[PDB]
Design a protein around this ligand. Structure first.
Ligand SMILES: N[C@@H](CCN[C@@H](CCN[C@@H](CCC(=O)O)C(=O)O)C(=O)O)C(=O)O
Ligand SMILES: N[C@@H](CCN[C@@H](CCN[C@@H](CCC(=O)O)C(=O)O)C(=O)O)C(=O)O
Ligand SMILES: [Br-]
Ligand SMILES: [Br-]
Lengths: 264, 264
C-alpha cells in the first residue's frame, strides 16, 4: 500500500523526535498547531477503519506512532492541569471552565454515554481516573443529576480536583483518593473508566472482582484513525466481560465509548 | 466472555452438521428456515463491528463458523444452479429471474457499487467469478449500459451462464472461460471481483500483475456480523493496493463493496 497519510504522519513525527523523552516540558500554547496537524488526520472521516489499521499496525510506523502518542498524552495532561489551576483562581469559574479547549467535545461525549448507559437522575455513578480537572464527574451531576464518586490515585491531584469542584459550587460530586479497589466499599449503578486510566489489565481485573452482572460499565477507548492518539483497550484487557453497545465518535470527539457487563 | 449468540450459533451449526451427515446434496427449499435463522443473526444492526469480531472470531466458535460458512456457499451455489436452469426453460425468463431469492439485494448492491465506481454507460467492465446465474454481469449491461466480460473458471458453469444470458435476450455480456489471468488479454475500465472468487490471495496477486494504477477495482467482502456468512478479504490479500472508498450494506444486502487502486 500507498496511503497519502503515511508520509503526512512520518513528517509530523519527524518534528516531534527532538522532544522525545521530554514532552512534559512542552509549551502548551506553542504546540497547539501540532495538535491541529495530528487531529486533521485523526478526524478525517474518509479514512476507513481497515486503512487506519493498515497504517497503525505496520512495523515501520511503530516509532512515529510512539512519538505522536507521547505528545498527545503529555499535552492533554498539561492542558487539564493548567485549566484546573485557572478555575480555582477565577472569579467566574464556570465561564473559565467553559473556555477549556476540549469542553465542547466533553459535552458531546457525555451525551453519547448517557444514551448508551441510560443515565437517570439520582442514579449513583463512580468514575475511575478523575485527574486534576474532573469534568466528567462534574457533568454527571450538573447535567445528568447523578450522585458521583470520582476516584483518583494521586493524593495531590485528588486535592486539586476537590478544589475545582468546590470552586464551581457543584453538588453531589466527591473525590476519593485511592486505586480502583476502593469500589469494594461503594454501592453504585454505573461505573465509568477514563480513557487514561492505566494499567488497563490490572484495572479491569479489579473491577471484575467488585461488580455484579447488572452493573453498567462504560469505558473509553480509541478506534479507527483516532487510535493514532493512544493505544486502544485490547481484547485481553476486557476478559470476563461482554460488550453490549458502542458509540463511535464524530466531529472533534476522540473517544469511542463501550458498554460492558460482567459475565454471565 | 459470554455471548448469548454463542449458544445460538453452536446450535445452528449442530443442525447443519447432522444434516450434512445424511445428505451431500442440498435441499434448497427445505433449508430456507436455517438460512433465515442465520441471516437474522447476520443482520442484527445493534452489533458494532468490533463486537462482531469478539463474538465470531472467538477460538471456540471456529468449528461452528466453518460449518455455517460452508452451508452459505453451498446453498448460494445450488440456488443459482437451480434458478439458471429455470430461466433457460421458462417462457417468461425475466419474471423467472426476478423471483430469484436474492434478486432485490443485487439491485441495491449494484446501485451502491455504481456510485462507488462512478460507472458510466459504454465503459468496459470485467467481472471475475460469474457463477451459473451471472446477475451482476446481466445488470451491468441491462441497467448500467456497460460492455461486459464475465469470467468463470468452471467450463460447464460458464456454458450454463451463456444460456441464461441468451434466454434473457441480454446484449453486451460475453462470458470468458478461464481464471483471473485472462484479464491480461482484455481491455477494461473497471474490474469487479466476486465475493465468492477464490482464493483471494492468488486472485489479487494476479490482478496486481495485469492492471495499471488508474484502473478502478471493486471487490466484495463481509464486515461486522455479516462475516458469519463468509471469510472477509484480509488486508494482507490486498497488499500492493490502496483502499479509496467503501460502501457498507444495510437492509438485507450482505456484501460490503471496496474500491481500490494498484499502488503506487
Ligand atoms: N479528567 C477527565 C479524565 C481525563 N481525560 C478523559 C479524556 C476525554 N476525551 C475527550 C477530550 C479530548 C481527548 O481526550 O483527546 C474526547 O474524547 O473528545 C479520559 O481520559 O477519559 C474527565 O473528567 O473525564
Ligand atoms: N452470480 C453472482 C456471483 C455470486 N454471488 C455474489 C454475491 C452477491 N451478494 C448479494 C446476494 C446475497 C448474498 O450473496 O449473500 C448481497 O450481498 O446481498 C458474489 O459472489 O459477488 C453475481 O453475478 O454477482
Ligand atoms: Br430446520
Ligand atoms: Br418475462
Amino acid at each position: 500500500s500507498c496511503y497519502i497519510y503515511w508520509d503526512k504522519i512520518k513528517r509530523i513525527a519527524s518534528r516531534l523526535e527532538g522532544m522525545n523523552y521530554h514532552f512534559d516540558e512542552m509549551d502548551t500554547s506553542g504546540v497547539m498547531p501540532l495538535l491541529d496537524e495530528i487531529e486533521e488526520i485523526a478526524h478525517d472521516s474518509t479514512i476507513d477503519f481497515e486503512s487506519a489499521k493498515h497504517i497503525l499496525d505496520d512495523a515501520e510506523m511503530n516509532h512515529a506512532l510512539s512519538l505522536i502518542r507521547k505528545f498527545y498524552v503529555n499535552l492533554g495532561m498539561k492542558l487539564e492541569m493548567e485549566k484546573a489551576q485557572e478555575v480555582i483562581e477565577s472569579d467566574s469559574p464556570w465561564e473559565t471552565l467553559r473556555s477549556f479547549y476540549f469542553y465542547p467535545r466533553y459535552l458531546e461525549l457525555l451525551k453519547n454515554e448517557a444514551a448508551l448507559g441510560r443515565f437517570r437522575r439520582g442514579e449513583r455513578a463512580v468514575f475511575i481516573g478523575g485527574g486534576p480537572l474532573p469534568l466528567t464527574g462534574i457533568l454527571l451531576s450538573h447535567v445528568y443529576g447523578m450522585r458521583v464518586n470520582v476516584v483518583e490515585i494521586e493524593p495531590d491531584i485528588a486535592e486539586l480536583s476537590r478544589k475545582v469542584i468546590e470552586g464551581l459550587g457543584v453538588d453531589g460530586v466527591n473525590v476519593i483518593t485511592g486505586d480502583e479497589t476502593v469500589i469494594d466499599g461503594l454501592e453504585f449503578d454505573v461505573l465509568m473508566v477514563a480513557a487514561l486510566a492505566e494499567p488497563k489489565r490490572r484495572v479491569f481485573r479489579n473491577i471484575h472482582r467488585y461488580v455484579d452482572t447488572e452493573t453498567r460499565i462504560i469505558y473509553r477507548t480509541y478506534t479507527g484513525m483516532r487510535a493514532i492518539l493512544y493505544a486502544p483497550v485490547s481484547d485481553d484487557d476486557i476478559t470476563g466481560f461482554r460488550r453490549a453497545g458502542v458509540v463511535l465518535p464524530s466531529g472533534k470527539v476522540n473517544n469511542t465509548s463501550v458498554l460492558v457487563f460482567k459475565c454471565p
